């Protein structure tokens, strides 16, 4: 029996006895993602090059997500990688939910046509006060839903909630997200490690030792393969589907890591944990970090539970 | 003025005073690339999952091979076809026989298909040189003999990169109209880049020259900035980023693979031809990739390619290790 | 604020305090219409002609609507123009609603590439009896929702409910129906008449007289223009947009006309009346006919109220 | 073997030993038609209605105009949208003159009726500097003509010396696929097509002929009536199903309504190449010598037997 993102989301809303507000948020997000996919894939580019005789993808993607979420009547605070401060929804359009998102992840990769994506995390506003940027400062444990859209060789939306992780393929012929992977679980242990080894000179000693174990296995297993696409959504999605480990640890140009807690690390950590994986900063679970800045960065090590636990053991040995 | 791949190829054929046979070959290739691209982006996947009930099923690698084979045969422009999917070269039937020999990888990056990472198609076009009946040996030409080569990349967007004597030109596929649009003319690679690309998981089996060269990128002895690392895992994606951003891409020989992994005829040679036409380099370490005279249509070759300064720097380290 | 069919349908369900079953039905119907539209526009026809080295459009369209409605868990009885008997949904997937539909209207225009469409009408099951065809034998007055999809120069879905008639344009780039005309109302009087004048030799006398007045007005008024696409959806949609009158009347050889009450006349009559128009069989309003057979025919005269009332005046003259 | 419009046009050019100029013209026109089809079908309409926070007539004209100019194959372009002929700048001039309606039937586009692009291609006849008069050639001189129908599906019908060929646009890949080769119209049809709202204005020959279709004096079956209201849609049905299409003169349109250069002549050329007929009542449409680029003509076209039967009735009334 075929299922779609629209029907699946609506059915889960009916099960939870929701008022329909979260369902409208997800429907609006789904529409914005389809519009981003069309633009990322350069539909209409012929008009830019004069077939009949202007917006950067970063701005258009932000505008698409911002406008659809505002018009959903489901949100009150919107945090985006593109905006210095949180956007406060006007009272007439205001709902209960706080959405933190990266409208287009993979900035180094647009010009070379490597996979990009959108990352999102949805929180519930806990106060009766007027909404503010402070409402976005919540640990990932408070996430109601999270996931990402990957604009790779095909477009797929991965949605994680209490019920688990579910993957939907965009059928561009009919503009419909089709459920293709139900209740997905990551492999217990993988065979691929993913990180930028160009920072080897500045690596944490724990990072250096862990990578050495991947290349020279102490138990005489086969060495891991290496893959680093350079876009977090692509590297994380491969980790979900194939298993393994993804790392963006602290380096010296990024003593707290590079990736952003609220809208990059927390959503990916939430997807991993709902899929039976792990996601750590080295000191604690990513989802347990209590942020003080909506744009604060965090080191992230996520993936198959046996691979993350192995890195943690190396990290503990180095204190 | 706006320019399309169809218009561009036709005009180049007019300039060269061709009979139109190569123009028809390229037209058929472009149509096949559009069809592969549509399937890669999963058009009609809803029917596979039962939107209409239990009433295509072919895997993308099979369908891509079928598309390129059928379109090239129907172009009336080819006589010998070499594919990664077939052990022996396909000899085109006499009724549909043209002058050209095409070696192609219909869908490069197989390990990345299920994780939705960029994949692509690679092709190299040769002119038949002998007067014998067409056979496999007509595909055993060095890359120097290439008439045209390039690739289609099915990434965040779909781009056809076409390299010929006139240089390298990039076309963006506009899916709204099914038209490849010329977006970068006569592209030239950077003299030197800041990205290195290889599978470092094989470090234990690295050739000593590779070990030293990679060490130079992570720990530059001259106090310059260490290079960034990128390894998508699909040759088309990694090569295209090298073309666009500069840098170096390596799939070298190792202790277990004396001839590397990538195939000379339809992976290394077309990429080498694109790199050289763009002002880059492509070597096996011992010689230029384009100068290797193959004896087997599926023989492997080590490949190091990218910005000329970076490739030369590797060759310096390679010669130090002899 | 931009509005989509998905968001509009969901919000109307929230206002109605529905359980979400009708919303799921409409979502499923929306997906099927997009799938039909993609097939009608011949997506993938290159593979049928051997680009890589069978099912009629009516059958595929019927399969799409049948499967999407069944999997919605919202229907119990399905009456299609393409099926001899009413289809009874398997007990595990049964919902409260009865759907009568023509999956592809205008079959004679398929091969000449003239506009075609899909017509649907939605009823609530009125009894707790075991579902059967009698649950579809309801007067059009009992309709909960009705409308049509038009696959013309563009694809549009027209949805009629208690709130009125709303028109949504399908954006193929993203597979989204965009609300473009809200709460639409037909003109009081039009200037176009629509019927197959090739049947003039067998015309009912009222039809002969009425059409004669349209072409040779006794006033000093201009004669009406003539349009007859040959697909009911296209001719009716033009009547809604421009005003005027559409007729497929009875004659001596066809005392009940040709068009079918359940899935052609009732849905179009419902749209017309919600738009401020009329639709009559001559003897009574189309929506007041109580059917006894699921494929029973009915004469239909519909359009602007002044034009329909003028025809009924001529109809009364000939008894 | 699968065949595309691009391959078909190129192979025909190779057969004709052309220099490739007309092939570039047809390739450019094919690209514009795909762009019009995407726009007609409302791709990206969500952005017009504010998803992120040019009228079809003008945009269709710009697509055809720009693609034809950049083809380097044209010198004079006549469009229904432009009052005067467009003269290509000398640097981009080719030998061909193109007369087209970029979007026919758009006068009723608000009801989503089928629309289309109609085109006729001429070789420049005179050696004078290019001007409007270069488009005043009879339809007899057409090198190529046809139309793109944006109906339930998009199809390009291309008529040349070799005959009439029909290509379906596969929107999944943006490729025109040859689906009907060397098509011929039925000798006699069963459908008549015209706006009977002008019945009060019809000349006695038209009135008698239509009466014969509804009341056949020989007890045969009456013809069916179809009138989409868009010339491309009605003519294509006539080509594919057989029958007759009529837009005769009336009080509002004493010289007819449809345009000779870019509506009647291309459709007349397609019909004759398909074994059909197209007449004004007095002469073949293709033999009329235009004096004004936007001049109108009455037209009766379709299956040869149906047009011949009309012409007997016309002769009966002188
Ligand atoms: C919208 C549907 C289902 C069909 C008909 C109704 C309309 C309104 C317009 C269709 C005209 C058309 C231009 C169809 C092409 C649709 C299409 C193939 C959309 C997706 O574009 P892709 O070429 O698939 O983009 P990607 O392959 O890069 O995802
Ligand atoms: N579509 C849905 N899928 C999963 N959970 C939902 C959905 N809708 C609502 N919920 C749950 O119900 C809560 C309240 O719903 P709402 O009234 O829509 O805010 C949410 O915070 C979720 O915990
Ligand atoms: N479209 C084209 N672009 C570039 N070079 C071409 C083209 N067509 C033909 N040529 C050149 O002309 C030669 C003969 O053309 P052909 O007659 O098509 O075999 C080719 O091998 C190329 O060197
Ligand atoms: N999306 C909707 N739009 C309009 N009316 C609705 C909607 N959902 C429910 N209703 C109304 O509420 C009734 C019961 O809804 P349900 O519980 O979904 O069967 C329907 O029969 C309609 O009258
Ligand atoms: N693709 C083609 N299809 C049919 N006829 C063509 C084609 N190309 C050229 N011709 C014929 O050759 C003539 C001269 O071609 P050209 O040199 O392209 O102007 C044209 O006017 C046509 O009669
Ligand atoms: O070049 P680096 O340092 O390895 O950065 C890679 C990471 O940076 C990012 O590009 C940051 O996201 P943005 O591109 O949206 O700024 C991640 O997607 C990616 O994982
Ligand atoms: O996993 P590895 O050893 O790094 O191999 C990666 C290379 O193998 C390939 O996948 C070989 O191409 P195919 O997938 O067509 O066999 C290249 O695309 C890629 O550069
Ligand atoms: O050719 P006729 O007798 O005028 O019939 C036209 C009518 O028949 C129909 O085609 C019946 O619908 P179907 O094509 O689905 O059978 C209507 O769409 C149309 O209004
Ligand atoms: O409304 P009428 O008088 O029947 O005219 C119909 C004719 O007018 C036209 O719409 C004129 O063409 P345009 O719509 O492009 O101006 C023809 O397509 C059609 O055959
Ligand atoms: Mg970003
Ligand atoms: Mg990011
Ligand atoms: Mg390969
Ligand atoms: Mg391969
Ligand atoms: Mg039907
Ligand atoms: Mg019908
Ligand atoms: Mg017009
Ligand atoms: Mg016109």
């Amino acid at each position: 029996d075929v299922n779609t993102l629209t029907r699946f989301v609506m059915e889960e809303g009916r099960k939870a006895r929701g008022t329909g507000e979260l369902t409208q948020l997800l429907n609006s997000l789904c529409t914005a993602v389809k519009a981003i996919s069309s633009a990322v894939r350069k539909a209409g580019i012929a008009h830019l090059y004069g077939i009949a005789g202007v917006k950067k993808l970063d701005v258009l993607s932000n505008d698409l997500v911002m406008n659809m979420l505002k018009s959903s009547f489901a949100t009150c605070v919107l945090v985006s990688e593109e905006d210095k401060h949180a956007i406060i929804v006007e009272p007439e359009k205001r709902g209960k939910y706080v959405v933190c998102f990266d409208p287009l992840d993979g900035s180094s990769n647009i010009d070379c046509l490597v996979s990009v994506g959108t990352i999102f995390g949805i929180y519930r506003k806990k106060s009766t006060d007027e909404p503010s940027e402070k409402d976005a400062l919540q640990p990932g444990r408070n996430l109601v839903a999270a996931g990402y859209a990957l604009y790779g060789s095909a477009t797929m939306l991965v949605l994680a909630m209490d019920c688990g992780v579910n993957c939907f393929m965009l059928d561009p012929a009919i503009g419909e997200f089709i459920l293709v992977d139900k209740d997905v679980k990551i492999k217990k242990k993988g065979k691929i490690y993913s990180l930028n080894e160009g920072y080897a000179r500045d690596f944490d000693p724990a990072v250096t030792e862990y990578i050495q174990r991947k290349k020279f296995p102490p138990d005489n297993s086969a060495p891991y393969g290496a893959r680093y696409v350079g876009s977090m959504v692509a590297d994380v999605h491969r980790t979900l589907v194939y298993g393994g480990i993804f790392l963006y640890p602290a380096n010296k140009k990024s003593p707290n890591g590079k990736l952003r807690l609220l809208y990059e690390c927390n959503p990916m950590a939430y997807v991993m944990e709902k899929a039976g994986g792990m996601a750590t900063t080295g000191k604690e679970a990513v989802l347990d970090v209590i942020p003080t800045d909506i744009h604060q960065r965090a080191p992230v090590i996520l993936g198959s539970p046996d691979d993350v636990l192995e890195f943690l053991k190396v990290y503990e040995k180095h204190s």
Side-chain angles (χ1 to χ4, degrees), chain A:
Chain A
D1 247 13
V2 66
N3 210 0
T4 70
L5 182 55
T6 305
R7 181 149 80 186
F8 171 93
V9 158
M10 177 72 175
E11 202 44 48
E12 290 296 325
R14 294 175 70 196
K15 285 175 178 168
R17 326 257 199 231
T19 66
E21 189 167 275
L22 182 56
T23 295
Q24 284 281 45
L25 195 162
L26 292 170
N27 296 335
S28 294
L29 194 59
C30 160
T31 298
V33 151
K34 289 194 293 176
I36 293 173
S37 187
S38 178
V40 163
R41 269 89 152 83
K42 302 301 180 173
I45 198 185
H47 284 275
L48 282 195
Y49 285 82
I51 190 164
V54 67
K55 218 134 64 163
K56 197 63 214 82
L57 270 172
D58 275 330
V59 178
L60 176 66
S61 301
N62 195 51
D63 292 341
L64 284 164
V65 179
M66 278 296 184
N67 187 69
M68 297 293 306
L69 286 178
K70 285 175 187 168
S71 61
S72 79
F73 284 56
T75 68
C76 55
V77 180
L78 298 170
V79 166
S80 160
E81 200 210 70
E82 289 301 309
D83 294 288
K84 182 170 185 181
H85 296 284
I87 278 44
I88 311 303
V89 178
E90 58 183 289
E92 307 89 326
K93 296 190 198 310
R94 213 172 270 172
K96 297 187 312 278
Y97 290 101
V98 176
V99 188
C100 311
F101 58 94
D102 184 356
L104 198 56
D105 176 65
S107 79
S108 115
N109 276 148
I110 321 98
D111 289 328
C112 67
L113 305 194
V114 160
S115 294
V116 292
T118 299
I119 316 165
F120 60 91
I122 296 152
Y123 307 80
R124 206 186 200 259
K125 178 179 183 269
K126 311 282 219 161
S127 43
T128 60
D129 320 326
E130 184 184 341
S132 88
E133 193 165 301
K134 295 306 179 32
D135 290 304
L137 304 175
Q138 299 193 52
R141 295 286 178 215
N142 290 9
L143 276 162
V144 171
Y148 55 91
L150 170 68
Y151 321 113
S153 64
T155 294
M156 150 165 311
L157 187 132
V158 179
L159 173 64
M161 314 204 271
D162 234 81
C163 66
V165 186
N166 293 277
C167 307
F168 305 78
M169 193 76 82
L170 180 58
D171 188 338
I174 59 165
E176 192 76 49
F177 279 109
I178 304 291
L179 179 59
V180 299
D181 302 307
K182 317 164 99 283
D183 203 12
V184 312
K185 301 303 184 183
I186 198 171
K187 280 185 210 172
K188 184 174 150 113
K189 184 142 118 83
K191 289 165 146 72
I192 299 169
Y193 73 94
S194 188
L195 85 166
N196 192 338
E197 292 202 61
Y199 307 124
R201 185 173 77 189
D202 304 300
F203 272 163
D204 227 302
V207 170
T208 302
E209 175 171 2
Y210 176 76
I211 295 317
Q212 279 297 276
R213 295 168 62 90
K214 296 308 103 177
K215 297 166 181 176
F216 305 87
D219 67 347
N220 203 42
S221 46
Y224 279 40
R227 292 291 193 267
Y228 194 65
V229 171
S231 294
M232 162 182 222
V233 292
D235 287 310
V236 168
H237 181 68
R238 187 199 52 251
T239 312
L240 177 70
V241 163
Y242 288 176
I245 192 167
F246 172 79
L247 314 85
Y248 206 121
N251 61 43
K252 252 69 158 201
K253 277 292 183 75
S254 299
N256 283 105
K258 177 187 175 175
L259 305 187
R260 315 276 193 176
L261 177 61
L262 269 195
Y263 41 86
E264 287 171 339
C265 297
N266 265 345
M268 283 330 183
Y270 184 87
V271 167
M272 282 293 152
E273 288 208 6
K274 296 313 202 183
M278 298 180 65
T280 184
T281 77
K283 295 135 298 283
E284 64 197 314
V286 176
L287 296 175
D288 285 317
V289 179
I290 300 171
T292 54
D293 186 334
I294 59 168
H295 295 300
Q296 86 175 58
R297 311 166 187 272
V300 57
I301 294 97
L302 57 79
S304 289
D306 281 8
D307 292 312
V308 169
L309 288 171
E310 189 184 332
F311 169 84
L312 280 179
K313 172 173 51 165
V314 177
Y315 183 89
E316 309 208 284
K317 139 165 161 193
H318 293 249
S319 319

